[PDB]
Amino acid sequence: PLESQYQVGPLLGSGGFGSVYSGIRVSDNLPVAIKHVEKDRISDWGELPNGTRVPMEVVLLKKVSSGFSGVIRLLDWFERPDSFVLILERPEPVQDLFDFITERGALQEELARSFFWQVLEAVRHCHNCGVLHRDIKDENILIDLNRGELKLIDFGSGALLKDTVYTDFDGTRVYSPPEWIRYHRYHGRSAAVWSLGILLYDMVCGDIPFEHDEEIIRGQVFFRQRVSSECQHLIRWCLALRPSDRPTFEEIQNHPWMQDVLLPQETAEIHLH
Numbered sequence: 001p002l003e004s005q006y007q008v009g010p011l012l013g014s015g016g017f018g019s020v021y022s023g024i025r026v027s028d029n030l031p032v033a034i035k036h037v038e039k040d041r042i043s044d045w046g047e048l049p050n051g052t053r054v055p056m057e058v059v060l061l062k063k064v065s066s067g068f069s070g071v072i073r074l075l076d077w078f079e080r081p082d083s084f085v086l087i088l089e090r091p092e093p094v095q096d097l098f099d100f101i102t103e104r105g106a107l108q109e110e111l112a113r114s115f116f117w118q119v120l121e122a123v124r125h126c127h128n129c130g131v132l133h134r135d136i137k138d139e140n141i142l143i144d145l146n147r148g149e150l151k152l153i154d155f156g157s158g159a160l161l162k163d164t165v166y167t168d169f170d171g172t173r174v175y176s177p178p179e180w181i182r183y184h185r186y187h188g189r190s191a192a193v194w195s196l197g198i199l200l201y202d203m204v205c206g207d208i209p210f211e212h213d214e215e216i217i218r219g220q221v222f223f224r225q226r227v228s229s230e231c232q233h234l235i236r237w238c239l240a241l242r243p244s245d246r247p248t249f250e251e252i253q254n255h256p257w258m259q260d261v262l263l264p265q266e267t268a269e270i271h272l273h
């Protein structure tokens, strides 16, 4: 009975993902996030090993929630008559990257390097677990303000990772690649790299580079803030129009702009405290 196991707090947010509340596990006072999703609104369904009908999100979270890392872990879940309820890790104090950027404006490159690196490690972890996130962006990353650690959230638009083409997409359009816009097709890793380019631009410029379909399709990157040449180069590389022209994760992390990253804790002490 989830009713008695958790003390429900205030609404943290709601939108396309459903409704997410602050909570506390009664047994040990562990801070949690309680996410409700209506079944009528669940588009993609999946199956547990033990053969049970469940939201793909839950399948993806399980595959990815084993071990430590930069992904928010699924602690438990429940099925209700017309909804599923997910119990998720909740860091505290925390702020999502979108609000963080809005507040501080464009980030110092040293900070953006540390954040971006951690996002890369998290996404690599998902891919190693057979999971494609598909909605990488500032709103889907949490910053643990005390530890300097980022955490990927919201796998509700995700899919099992495969090497064949995807012909469906339900992530954020302004983060979707030109091949989706033009052809309604993309491959997982290379689409992910494109969204990482948007994300990195967003961090160092304090806003998204493209707003309309035609800008995405043109792929011309204009910098509105001062950004080093190395960083501009990495961004333009991630945002190559031809998917095959984009860097692999390894090539991103071996890029000269990516060298000498701060540890998360160093990052918090310098930039967060």
Ligand SMILES: CN1CCN(c2cc3c(-c4cccc(N5CCNCC5)n4)n[nH]c3cn2)CC1=O
Pocket: 012, 013, 017, 020, 032, 033, 035, 072, 088, 089, 090, 091, 094, 095, 096, 139, 140, 142, 153, 154, 155, 156
């Ligand atoms: C799209 N989306 C956004 C909220 N999300 C989430 C938030 C949290 C949080 C959390 C903690 C503190 C604040 C906070 N919100 C996130 C929304 N923006 C305000 C801060 N979320 N902890 N754990 C979470 C797990 N998922 C579920 C989800 O699917």
